[PDB]
Design an enzyme around this catalytic site. Structure first.
Site, short mmCIF file in Angstrom:
data_model
loop_
_atom_site.label_atom_id
_atom_site.label_comp_id
_atom_site.label_asym_id
_atom_site.label_seq_id
_atom_site.Cartn_x
_atom_site.Cartn_y
_atom_site.Cartn_z
N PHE A 117 34.10 65.12 46.79
CA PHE A 117 34.81 66.56 46.38
C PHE A 117 34.76 66.70 45.35
O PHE A 117 34.92 67.84 44.79
CB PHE A 117 36.24 66.78 47.57
CG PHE A 117 37.28 66.05 46.45
CD1 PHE A 117 37.65 65.83 45.03
CD2 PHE A 117 37.54 64.62 47.28
CE1 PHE A 117 38.29 65.04 44.86
CE2 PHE A 117 38.20 63.48 46.12
CZ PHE A 117 38.98 63.83 44.55
N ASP A 118 34.48 65.89 44.43
CA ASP A 118 33.79 66.50 43.34
C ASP A 118 33.05 66.62 42.09
O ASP A 118 33.29 64.36 43.31
CB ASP A 118 35.48 66.48 42.44
CG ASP A 118 35.89 67.14 40.74
OD1 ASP A 118 34.74 66.80 40.55
OD2 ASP A 118 36.38 67.04 40.34
N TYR B 10 47.75 64.52 45.04
CA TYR B 10 48.41 66.13 45.20
C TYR B 10 49.31 65.83 46.06
O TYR B 10 49.99 66.90 46.63
CB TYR B 10 47.49 66.96 46.04
CG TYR B 10 46.15 67.56 44.48
CD1 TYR B 10 46.59 68.77 43.74
CD2 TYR B 10 44.92 66.81 44.80
CE1 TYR B 10 45.18 68.33 43.39
CE2 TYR B 10 43.74 66.70 43.95
CZ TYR B 10 44.20 68.44 42.84
OH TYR B 10 43.71 68.21 42.31
N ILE C 175 46.43 65.52 37.62
CA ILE C 175 47.48 64.32 39.15
C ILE C 175 47.83 62.96 38.34
O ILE C 175 47.60 62.53 37.27
CB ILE C 175 47.13 64.17 40.22
CG1 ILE C 175 45.48 63.22 40.03
CG2 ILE C 175 46.28 64.89 40.72
CD1 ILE C 175 44.56 62.84 41.03
N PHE D 102 37.94 57.60 42.96
CA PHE D 102 37.34 57.92 41.93
C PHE D 102 36.20 56.81 41.73
O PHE D 102 36.63 56.03 41.60
CB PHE D 102 38.26 58.33 40.83
CG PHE D 102 39.11 59.61 41.26
CD1 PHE D 102 38.68 61.07 42.39
CD2 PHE D 102 40.64 60.08 40.31
CE1 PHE D 102 39.40 62.05 41.90
CE2 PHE D 102 41.19 60.90 40.68
CZ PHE D 102 40.99 62.12 40.94
#
Lengths: 541, 613, 318, 107
Positions: free
Chosen positions: D36-37, D82, D56, D99
């Site tokens: 998503f990133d 989130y 976050i 990540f």
């Protein structure tokens, strides 16, 4: 023809409290509407189309109901069914003056009553009264002995297309209503006009087919405005209410009615939506009629029987209706998108959703974000995409069936060359089914995409089988440094494999294997990275 | 077996012996969509065969392009999370994608990033509000023609790209690398198209150019590019060439738009230089008048000269105002209509908009000037704070939403310039925007700040108050229930303005009182009538008469109703009070006094109201 | 106050000088589009026709149409021998638009604009007057041919509806302005120019237009306008019947009212100018006689009292 | 909760502290591996002060464990991410974040 009062004569609008009986003068929108229309029928069968003669008796006939206007003791002056409409109750005649005051002409007869200029007082010959009106905008009319001077009703011709439309409304209502009453008969009776009906449906759809792009623009816009006009002309008379309640009564089933009928049913319902679509292709107001009704459409979106036609409907509803775009909320879009999940990549669906997303001009931002939250984050549905780096593998020329071993020293790893981490899986694989075609190989491709594959190293070392990234621990807990020496082992028959980083063990790993394949070592690689094979110049023994 | 793409370019193997040193040189990458439902990755370049998914996916791109929504940006970051930045850039660089997809990704690169900034930019690009900075003095209508000069200045608020961060307003790209990229794309297009090799990139010339000329066109309307790159553009057009190329009736439209940016920018330079001369000449003339309101009339005396040796300077510059894109635009439009019988009306409308801009640039200036408005160099920063706010409300014109407009209208309320330069404010037409939003809202508690704004906008000046006065029939038709006190503010002050109003408006209002036979709405309407008649001092007769004739019929023992209101809501008594007040503001016209004496007949109301203390 | 004086200077240098008669270009622009499966001028005309023919409820202010319509509007015995060359030049220009279907464009635009009196309609009438000007037979015949070949119906609804609004004169409006006819001029010049050259067929067409579904008599409308217009004139006389001496505003706009009533009696007389007996009978049984009577009241008393002083004889003259 | 795992070693010395301007490359994928990133897609490194709560919580606590030059897989807990809200349009509610962080340099 219309009867202009100076505003024009008409009756109550469809689905009225009146039961559509009582007559009214009215101006405004009705003047363009079909219920304003009035056929003028002389009593003679022969030569009725002869010029209208002053003072000759004539039944007046509202078209859309089909009913004849008549004096009646029961309810005062009223339009009424022909069965009750004996000539004595319903005669009338047009005249130059209030004063009071013969032989038939078998011919076209003398010219007289010009449209829009020859004013004509109405009179009921059987009673000698007058078409008076009482003194909102419903100036109600009743027969009366006198009548003040502005009562004159100059005539105005209906258009061909429009009267065709109106008579068509009579035939249409008169078929679908009895269709509905026939649907009611078996709704409570588990165990019908039909092909008569379907011909009417196909014909109403043909009657509303939008003009071709192939047409030159002027004829196109003419046929188009005629189309919008006819759409409205079925709009005021509740043709939409009729089609929707027919769809309501037909949506009960997925089949009562006999099987002879049920086989046509799948057509009929779907055909109806097609028909329905036709009434809302263009005209906005009909979409405004669906503004309250959208939730209905949404449920019927989910029916998956007639299927696509309900979607084309909803799409016609959205493409031309800010109101409908405003009213729509969570549930409906979630059901739309859920349909996208339930059929699979109709592009029509996405067309519906972008049509939700942006009204002609203005954006509707809640709807937009709602489209986002109910689509994008899940990623599971619509075609997600990414700029993947190529994987590419190489093997030593000779494969393997006893026990075997090989080193593979790393040479020059560049970690994040490009956005992706550079690929360096290394490990055994069988010939029969491992075909790492460089362009897209399941997942995002690469080594380890297959059960055939048996691999190690890359990104914390560890292993891939099937496709799963199983993170076996190693004493170094390192990737593949350019200094690093990968080490690989295998045995015949026995399914054992085990790996070493820089000459020391990285625990046990995956076991059971097919011997159907003939195993060979594999070194996958990506970017500019290079590695030394060491089939045996060993630096570890 | 399933045929699939051979991969247009593939890896460099570089193996050898000894240790058999396999090796590689450079990265290569698939543009790879996948299907999660089948969990199968595939390069999008392959997609030009299994074209059902091409349709589906091009519509996914329509959906992203739509959901970014023109004027929306909160959504766009997610689109950054999906479509992916780098993926866009690779989508642009390669020239083997099938064309609906290709143009779809260019459309996304426009929308997700460039488009909203282009909406912020264009509407203000229409405005010409130049600073009196020293930089805006040495402009000169001629170089010591050729557009695209860096001295265009004006104000024209800066772009705000928030970087697309995902830990925790508009998505960011490298603007310069991208301008260079698009420029290289137009160059590659002019070259490959100029040799007439026919891949043709998108499978059509239309796809070969239209998306790219679009990207460059928004990119340039945006003001990205820096003199020489614009020169690259114009050399790729005129040259003095893409313009001379044979074209599909599509690319020509993008040429019409791009060239429209050139002509519009030329208008920018023209009006701006003319204003710079307003400084360079007025600084001289003011010294002349002081060497020796109505001062404007004296300035008109300065303007009588063509029919004090400073007048000759005017006698050159006006001839400068007389003015080679002026060749090519007319010649090319005329060539285009001449040789083709173009269809797609839009292209035509663009063409002759260009053409009318070409043969009547003096009039294009004459329409451009009222929107232009010179500004003192010190204060401009406040306008820089101002314009962007307007952009915001102009973003709201095409649509929570309400909080933005509230805080923005408030920010406009706070500005010093909104005091100091009302003429700029009516010249922007911003009140018309605020009313436009005001009416879109009407059909709450966002209406309110908007009304305070239009009312105070009435307050700031009378000449501006007539500018608000023009809209009263609109403002009253809009008032079904407050815009009406905005109209009241419109009517509150000037006597000439109270005379200027049509009887039809008061008729609409009293018709509203006809609708109030059942209220507070009525006392509101009566209040509007109150300002309508009473004016400053004795009420104007011209309106008072008509209002009473209308109140003979519409606002319907009536004096008993006062005590009935006292026995308790009181708002009905406030309505009777507003009514008797409105009739208390009315005095040929002797007879109307009898009409009012007919309704003292009062007397007891003062006693009952005193007893109700 | 340098910014103030500079904005003011923009206002003054726009108020004058920028107003040079540049518009001489417009004429050549036309021929530049005349240069040659048609022609660019024809492209633009057919484009506007494409716009008129679309349903839009009401047409939007098409700025470009107003502009090019104004452009085409400006596009059009030694003194006798020059006059033949001049009239023929005018006919060359009018045909320069006529061959390219601009007549039908004007006609469709007035049709499409319906009963609103937008400025754009005013431009359609400017162009129509530019096309007819001298009373071309060619144009009148192509327009009648257009209107019969396509029974619009709503064209005369448009003229009638705008004429129901139009402009008058009004008494109270002058009473409160004390402390816009050009369009009616264009419109009845329009209706006169439709009938010039004694076109019997088109006058009779105005009387009824037989082919359409709704007959609409432009003449009885026009007489209705002439009627309300005298009524306004007469009341405006009673505003000054006591006052003897007349305000210059009362001697200005009153003259405008005279320009109107003159353009309109010219329209009626142009409608009856042939011996088309039917239009005569139509207008005779219409309420014109009230109108000539009322002008006869205004033309009695104004005709006496305007004579009383030298300043008003100019207004007596008109 | 959050469960940082080492991918490649750094200096092993220079851990993030209060007030430092952390400079990192990273990428962000879901539980399903759905990215998503990705910072490298921008080819622009990401810069955040740590403990400034601009990020976050799992990023704010887990990067501290990382050293300069270190690459690490931050399998951050959603609650530290989130949360039940989920980042609109991108991250589904209660989605654990994965990540592949690479801390370039503290500043």
């Amino acid at each position: 023809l219309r009867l202009f009062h100076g505003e024009c004569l008409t009756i109550s609008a469809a689905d009225s409290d009146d039961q559509r009986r009582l007559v009214y003068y009215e101006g405004g929108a009705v003047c363009t509407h079909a219920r304003s229309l009035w056929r003028l029928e002389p009593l003679r069968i022969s030569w009725s189309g002869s010029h209208l003669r002053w003072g000759q008796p004539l039944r007046i006939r509202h078209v859309t109901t089909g009913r004849y206007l008549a004096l009646t003791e029961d309810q005062g002056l009223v339009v009424v069914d022909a069965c009750k409409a004996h000539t004595k109750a319903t005669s009338f005649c047009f005249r130059v003056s209030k004063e009071k005051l013969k032989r038939d002409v078998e011919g076209m007869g003398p010219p007289e009553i010009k449209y829009g200029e020859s004013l004509c007082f109405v009179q009921h010959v059987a009673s000698g009264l007058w078409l008076t009106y009482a003194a909102v905008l419903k100036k109600k009319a009743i027969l009366h002995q006198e009548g003040h001077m502005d009562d004159a009703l100059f005539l105005t011709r209906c258009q061909q297309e429009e009267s065709q439309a109106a008579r068509m409304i009579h035939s249409t209502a008169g078929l679908y209503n009895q269709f509905i009453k026939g649907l009611d008969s078996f709704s409570g009776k588990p165990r019908l006009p039909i092909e008569a009906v379907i011909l009417s449906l196909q014909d109403l759809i043909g009657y509303f087919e939008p003009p071709s792009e192939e047409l030159q623009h002027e004829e196109k816009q003419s046929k188009l405005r005629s189309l919008r006009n006819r759409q409205s002309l079925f709009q005021e008379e509740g043709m939409l209410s009729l089609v929707l309640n027919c769809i309501d009564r037909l949506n009960v089933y997925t089949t009562y009615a006999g099987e002879e009928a049920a086989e046509s049913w799948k057509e009929i319902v779907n055909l109806l939506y097609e028909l329905l679509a036709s009434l809302i292709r263009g005209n906005r107001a009909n979409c405004a009629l669906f503004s309250t009704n959208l939730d209905w459409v949404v449920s019927k979106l989910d029916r998956l029987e007639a299927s696509s036609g309900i979607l084309e409907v909803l799409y016609c509803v959205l493409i031309e209706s800010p109101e409908v775009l405003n009213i729509i909320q969570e549930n409906h879009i979630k059901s739309i998108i859920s349909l996208l999940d339930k059929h699979g990549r109709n592009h029509k669906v996405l067309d519906v959703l972008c049509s939700l997303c942006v009204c002609n001009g203005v954006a509707v931002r809640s709807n937009q974000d709602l489209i986002t939250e109910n689509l994008l984050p899940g990623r599971e549905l619509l075609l997600q995409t990414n700029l993947i780096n190529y994987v590419t593998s190489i093997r030593p020329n000779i494969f393997v069936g006893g026990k075997w071993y090989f080193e593979v020293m790393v040479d020059e790893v560049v970690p994040f060359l490009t956005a992706q981490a550079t690929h360096l899986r290394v490990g055994w694989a069988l010939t029969e089914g491992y075909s790492p075609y460089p362009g897209g190989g399941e997942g995002w491709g690469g080594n380890g995409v297959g059960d055939d594959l048996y691999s190690y190293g890359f990104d914390g070392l560890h292993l891939w089988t099937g496709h799963v990234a199983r993170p076996v621990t190693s004493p170094g807990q390192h990737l593949l440094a350019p200094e690093d020496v990968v080490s690989c082992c295998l045995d015949l028959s026995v399914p054992s494999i085990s790996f070493r980083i820089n000459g020391c063990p990285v625990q046990g790993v995956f076991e059971a294997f097919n011997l159907d394949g003939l195993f060979f070592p594999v070194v996958s690689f990506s970017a500019g990275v290079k590695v030394r094979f060491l089939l045996g110049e060993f630096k570890f023994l | 077996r399933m045929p699939n793409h051979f991969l247009q370019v593939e890896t460099r193997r570089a193996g050898e012996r000894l240790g058999w040193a396999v090796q590689c040189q450079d990265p290569l990458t698939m543009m790879a969509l996948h299907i999660p439902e089948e969990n199968r990755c595939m390069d999008i370049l392959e997609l030009s065969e299994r074209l059902d998914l091409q349709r589906f996916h091009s519509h996914t791109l329509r959906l992203y392009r739509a959901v970014c929504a023109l004027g929306n940006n909160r959504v766009a970051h997610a689109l950054c999370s999906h479509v992916d930045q780098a993926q866009l850039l690779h989508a642009l660089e390669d020239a083997h994608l099938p064309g609906p997809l290709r143009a779809g990704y260019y459309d996304l690169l426009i929308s997700i990033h460039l488009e909203s900034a282009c909406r912020s930019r264009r509407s203000m690009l229409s405005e010409y509000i130049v600073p009196l900075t020293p930089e805006t003095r040495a402009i000169t209508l001629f170089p010591p023609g050729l557009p695209g000069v860096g001295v265009t200045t004006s104000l024209r608020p800066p772009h705000h790209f928030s970087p697309p961060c995902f830990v925790a307003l508009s998505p960011a790209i490298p603007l310069e690398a991208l301008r260079d990229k698009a420029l290289r794309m137009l160059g590659e297009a002019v070259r490959d198209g100029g040799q007439h090799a026919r891949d043709p990139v998108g499978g059509s010339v239309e796809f070969q150019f239209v998306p790219v000329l679009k990207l460059v066109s928004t990119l340039l309307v945006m003001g990205i590019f820096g003199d020489e790159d614009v020169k690259q553009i114009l050399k790729m057009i005129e040259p003095e060439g893409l313009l001379q190329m044979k074209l599909p009736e599509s690319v020509k439209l993008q040429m019409c738009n791009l060239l429209e940016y050139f002509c519009d920018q030329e208008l920018q330079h023209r009006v701006e230089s003319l204003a710079a001369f307003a400084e360079r000449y007025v600084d001289k003339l003011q010294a002349n008048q002081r060497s020796r309101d109505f001062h404007q009339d004296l300035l008109a005396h300065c303007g009588i000269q063509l029919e004090t040796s400073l007048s000759s300077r005017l006698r050159s510059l006006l001839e400068t105002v007389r003015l080679s894109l002026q060749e090519l635009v007319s010649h090319m439009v005329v060539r285009w209509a001449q040789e083709d019988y173009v269809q797609s009306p839009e292209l035509v409308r663009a063409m002759f908009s260009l053409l009318h801009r070409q043969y009547d640039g003096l009039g294009e200036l004459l329409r451009a000037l009222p929107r232009a408005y010179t500004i003192s160099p010190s204060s401009v920063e406040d306008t820089m704070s101002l314009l962007e706010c307007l952009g915001q409300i102009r973003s709201l014109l095409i649509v929570q939403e309400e909080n933005l407009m509230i805080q923005s209208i408030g920010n406009i309320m706070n500005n010093k310039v909104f005091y100091q330069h009302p003429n700029l404010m009516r010249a922007l037409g911003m009140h018309e925007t605020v009313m436009e939003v005001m009416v879109n809202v009407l059909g709450p508690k966002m209406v309110t700040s908007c009304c305070r704004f239009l009312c105070y906008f009435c307050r700031i000046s009378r000449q501006n108050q007539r500018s608000m006065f023009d809209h009263l029939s609109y403002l009253l038709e809009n008032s079904g229930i407050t815009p009406l006190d905005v109209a009241a503010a419109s009517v509150i002050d000037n006597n000439e303005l109270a005379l200027a109003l049509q009887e039809q408006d008061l008729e609409k209002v009293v018709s509203y009182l006809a609708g109030c036979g059942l209220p507070c709405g009525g006392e509101r309407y009566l209040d509007f009538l109150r300002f309508a008649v009473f004016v400053n001092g004795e009420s104007v007769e011209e309106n008072a008469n008509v209002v009473v004739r209308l109140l003979i019929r519409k606002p319907e023992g009536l004096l008993a109703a006062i005590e009935e209101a006292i026995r308790i809501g009181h708002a009905i008594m406030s309505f009777y009070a507003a009514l008797i007040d409105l009739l208390g503001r009315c005095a040929e016209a002797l007879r109307i006094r009898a009409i009012l004496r007919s309704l003292l007949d009062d007397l007891v109301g003062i006693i009952s109201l005193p007893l109700q203390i | 106050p340098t910014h103030r004086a500079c904005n003011m200077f923009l206002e003054s240098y726009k108020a004058a000088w920028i107003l040079t008669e540049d518009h001489s270009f417009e004429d050549r622009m036309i021929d530049d589009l005349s240069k040659a499966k048609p022609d660019p001028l024809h492209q633009l005309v057919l484009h506007f026709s494409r716009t008129a023919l679309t349903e839009k409820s009401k047409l939007d202010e098409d700025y470009l149409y107003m502009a090019y319509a104004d452009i085409m509007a400006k596009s059009c015995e030694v003194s006798f021998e020059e006059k033949e060359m001049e009239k023929q030049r005018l006919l060359y220009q009018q045909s320069r638009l006529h061959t390219r279907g601009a007549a039908e464009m004007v006609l469709q635009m007035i049709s499409a604009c319906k009963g609103e009196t937008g400025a754009m309609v005013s431009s359609t009438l400017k162009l129509g007057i530019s096309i007819l000007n001298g009373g071309n037979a060619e144009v009148q015949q192509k327009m009648l041919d257009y209107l019969k070949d396509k029974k619009e119906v709503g064209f005369f609804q448009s003229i009638q509806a705008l004429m129901q609004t139009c402009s008058v004169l009004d008494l109270n409006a002058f009473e409160r302005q004390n402390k816009d006819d050009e369009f009616t001029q264009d419109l009845f010049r329009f209706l006169q120019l439709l009938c010039e050259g004694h076109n019997n067929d088109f006058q009779n067409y105005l009387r009824t237009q037989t082919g359409n579904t709704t007959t609409i008599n432009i003449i009885i409308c026009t007489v209705d306008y002439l009627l309300r217009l005298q009524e306004s004139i007469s009341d405006f006389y009673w505003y000054y019947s006591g006052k003897d001496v007349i305000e210059e505003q009362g001697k200005r706009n009153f003259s405008k009212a005279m320009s109107v009533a003159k353009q309109v009696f010219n329209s009626l007389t142009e409608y009856i100018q042939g011996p088309c007996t039917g239009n005569q009978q139509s207008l005779a049984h219409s309420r014109l006689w009230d109108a000539v009577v009322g002008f006869l009241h205004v033309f009695a008393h104004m005709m006496m009292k305007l004579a009383q002083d030298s300043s008003q004889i100019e207004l007596l003259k008109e | 909760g959050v469960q940082v795992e080492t991918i490649s070693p750094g200096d092993g010395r220079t851990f993030p502290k209060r007030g430092q301007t952390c400079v990192v490359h990273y990428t962000g994928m879901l539980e399903d591996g759905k990215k998503f990133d990705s910072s490298r897609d921008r080819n622009k490194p990401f810069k955040f002060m740590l403990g400034k709560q601009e990020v976050i919580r799992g990023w704010e606590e887990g990067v501290a464990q990382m050293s300069v030059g270190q690459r690490a897989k931050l399998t951050i807990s959603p609650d530290y991410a989130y949360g039940a809200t989920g980042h609109p349009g991108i991250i589904p509610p209660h989605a654990t974040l994965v990540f592949d962080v690479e801390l370039l340099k503290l500043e």
